[PDB]
Design a protein around this ligand. Structure first.
Ligand SMILES: CC(=O)N[C@H]1[C@@H](O[C@H]2[C@@H](O)[C@@H](CO)O[C@@H](O[C@H]3[C@H](O[C@@H]4O[C@@H](C)[C@@H](O)[C@@H](O)[C@@H]4O)[C@@H](O)[C@H](O)O[C@@H]3CO)[C@@H]2O[C@@H]2O[C@@H](C)[C@@H](O)[C@@H](O)[C@@H]2O)O[C@H](CO)[C@H](O)[C@@H]1O
Ligand SMILES: CC(=O)N[C@H]1[C@@H](O[C@H]2[C@@H](O)[C@@H](CO)O[C@@H](O[C@H]3[C@H](O[C@@H]4O[C@@H](C)[C@@H](O)[C@@H](O)[C@@H]4O)[C@@H](O)[C@H](O)O[C@@H]3CO)[C@@H]2O[C@@H]2O[C@@H](C)[C@@H](O)[C@@H](O)[C@@H]2O)O[C@H](CO)[C@H](O)[C@@H]1O
Ligand SMILES: CC(=O)N[C@H]1[C@@H](O[C@H]2[C@@H](O)[C@@H](CO)O[C@@H](O[C@H]3[C@H](O[C@@H]4O[C@@H](C)[C@@H](O)[C@@H](O)[C@@H]4O)[C@@H](O)[C@H](O)O[C@@H]3CO)[C@@H]2O[C@@H]2O[C@@H](C)[C@@H](O)[C@@H](O)[C@@H]2O)O[C@H](CO)[C@H](O)[C@@H]1O
Ligand SMILES: CC(=O)N[C@H]1[C@@H](O[C@H]2[C@@H](O)[C@@H](CO)O[C@@H](O[C@H]3[C@H](O[C@@H]4O[C@@H](C)[C@@H](O)[C@@H](O)[C@@H]4O)[C@@H](O)[C@H](O)O[C@@H]3CO)[C@@H]2O[C@@H]2O[C@@H](C)[C@@H](O)[C@@H](O)[C@@H]2O)O[C@H](CO)[C@H](O)[C@@H]1O
Ligand SMILES: CC(=O)N[C@H]1[C@@H](O[C@H]2[C@@H](O)[C@@H](CO)O[C@@H](O[C@H]3[C@H](O[C@@H]4O[C@@H](C)[C@@H](O)[C@@H](O)[C@@H]4O)[C@@H](O)[C@H](O)O[C@@H]3CO)[C@@H]2O[C@@H]2O[C@@H](C)[C@@H](O)[C@@H](O)[C@@H]2O)O[C@H](CO)[C@H](O)[C@@H]1O
Lengths: 95, 95, 96, 96, 100
């Protein structure tokens, strides 16, 4: 298996790593039909989503983003799909 | 996808955004059948979460409200269906 | 729909509001068969249960709520309870 | 329904109350096949398990409760345990 | 049943116990297809994963619980005492964790 988020991210097409090193600025979530999604932003002007639906991992990701937001946990890197707008989170690291 | 709560909210009929910028004043939860969640703010607003991709999102929104309440997190905006009393929560943003 | 716990409570029978305005004193839970239940107490001498069981998920949520309220010493405002059970059975909770 | 952990525990065969009044010393959790279990220890020398399931939701809830009690250093009042297992197997927990 | 993580670990092939006694340095999780996994590291250079579910049917719940545990451990800076890991995987795969 990959040893870290950068190696993991590299195994996928249409991805990149954002090095953030900052807490989440805003956290948004929606239960509205066909838009069951989460959005986060950062002070650097980045906006990322967790896309509407593996199914278990998407739910876990939204759980992680929420508690990271509320606890002001520093996000190190995000691996994101850059063929979606907002870019879609594939992986997160916290250090 | 929508980049923020205001864009998301616009995609539905009978929705509106409320700008709150305040912590939740009260959190009410009911298991009595026919299963309410209710929040209030000091500005005098009352919202509910009404009882599938959507079923899991509904359960998540209730989790988010309880933890926002307990952590005293500032709620930025809510997207609500205004054809229900209290108004019914579609999305939340926290900043 | 109801807009507060007091309004909500009065839409059911065999209920009343306890106005607690206090943290939970103790929290008890059991996985023993037929007694899959939670019990809370307060300083004022009151003992309440979450009865052994969608509505299913509401009951699990209630127990999650009481555990976290207990652990964080969150002030409980009111409980709507069924008073035809012993201990009285929690229908709803408000925290303010 | 029982009004506290002791009454509850008394309804079952092969159980006992351990009165601990202390935080959990160690928390151990396993995903290994056939050993999907939790173990807790106390400073007084006691070791307890949550048995691998063989009630399902309540068993998962109990593991959640033990983990958060441990991390928050929550004082465990009493444990109702089955004593025909080694380690004794947790049926119920009270915190105060 | 085993009474501790070492006894437990000794019942399995291809495992060892790492005695860590330290909080988690980094926590990583991915939802990317066939890489639904968590990775943790420690200051001493250890890297461990919770493997993608591949496992029986009761293990699935326990895999999900482990990832929950590692996330909250990391966020609360809980000292991890020992890990029982399969060492025929890289990163080594977590079978059990003890916290003290
Ligand atoms: C939080 C917020 O207000 N977001 C809105 C904003 O987001 C974009 C802007 O912040 C611009 C400013 O340059 O950057 C876009 O991202 C670029 C990215 O730029 C670099 O990273 C960002 C985070 C900043 O650090 C920039 O200064 C950097 O140069 C490039 O590296 C990348 O190649 O291209 C993207 C654009 O495709 C911001 O876009 C948002 O965030 C990124 C990461 C993507 O997820 C993108 O899809 C997002 O839209 O303005 C946009 C409108 O363009 C929206 O209104 C956001 O709400
Ligand atoms: C917390 C509380 O006391 N709630 C009870 C209260 O709630 C209503 C009042 O607060 C009135 C005062 O005029 O406003 C209602 O909301 C209006 C809304 O007004 C605007 O937003 C509110 C929150 C205040 O800040 C006002 O000053 C604002 O002008 C209008 O913008 C909107 O078009 O219409 C609604 C009414 O539907 C409050 O109603 C509650 O909150 C809103 C957001 C809805 O969800 C609604 O369904 C709620 O009832 O009084 C009512 C009965 O009058 C109940 O007792 C509430 O529990
Ligand atoms: C925490 C504890 O040890 N509880 C045990 C105890 O609880 C009962 C006592 O606390 C008595 C003392 O009067 O009150 C019972 O409650 C009454 C209630 O009284 C009001 O609330 C209590 C908590 C006090 O604050 C009083 O001053 C109040 O007036 C009445 O209003 C109500 O009509 O009747 C109940 C009794 O049926 C306590 O009973 C427990 O808690 C109440 C809220 C119910 O849920 C009831 O079912 C509970 O048993 O004593 C009992 C045995 O009598 C148990 O051992 C409790 O565990
Ligand atoms: C934490 C630890 O190191 N645990 C290992 C240990 O646990 C046993 C010892 O702690 C002995 C020491 O006397 O007591 C056992 O428990 C007894 C119990 O004794 C009393 O209660 C305990 C908690 C202590 O306070 C003692 O001082 C008391 O005398 C009796 O009440 C009971 O009737 O019998 C049990 C034994 O079954 C400890 O056993 C463990 O904990 C108990 C509560 C059970 O769950 C039991 O199954 C456990 O084994 O030693 C054992 C092997 O002997 C393991 O190595 C533990 O890891
Ligand atoms: C945190 C980090 O940056 N990790 C990257 C790193 O990890 C390996 C190194 O840290 C070396 C140091 O020699 O040890 C590897 O583990 C060995 C293990 O060595 C002993 O334990 C570690 C924790 C150190 O304390 C060493 O000093 C010890 O000698 C041996 O006992 C074992 O037989 O072999 C393993 C693997 O070579 C680290 O590997 C990672 O951690 C271990 C526990 C396993 O889970 C392993 O599979 C992991 O890869 O370097 C690797 C590339 O080699 C990656 O870049 C890591 O991200």
């Amino acid at each position: 298996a990959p040893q870290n988020i950068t190696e993991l991210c590299s195994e996928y097409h249409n991805t990149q790593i954002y090095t953030i090193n900052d807490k989440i600025l805003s956290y948004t979530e929606s239960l509205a039909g066909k838009r069951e999604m989460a959005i986060i932003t950062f002070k650097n002007g980045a906006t990322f989503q967790v896309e509407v639906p593996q199914k278990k991992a998407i739910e876990r990701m939204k759980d992680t983003l929420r508690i990271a937001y509320l606890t002001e946990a520093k996000v190190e890197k995000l691996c994101v799909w850059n063929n979606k707008t907002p870019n879609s989170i594939a992986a997160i690291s916290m250090a």
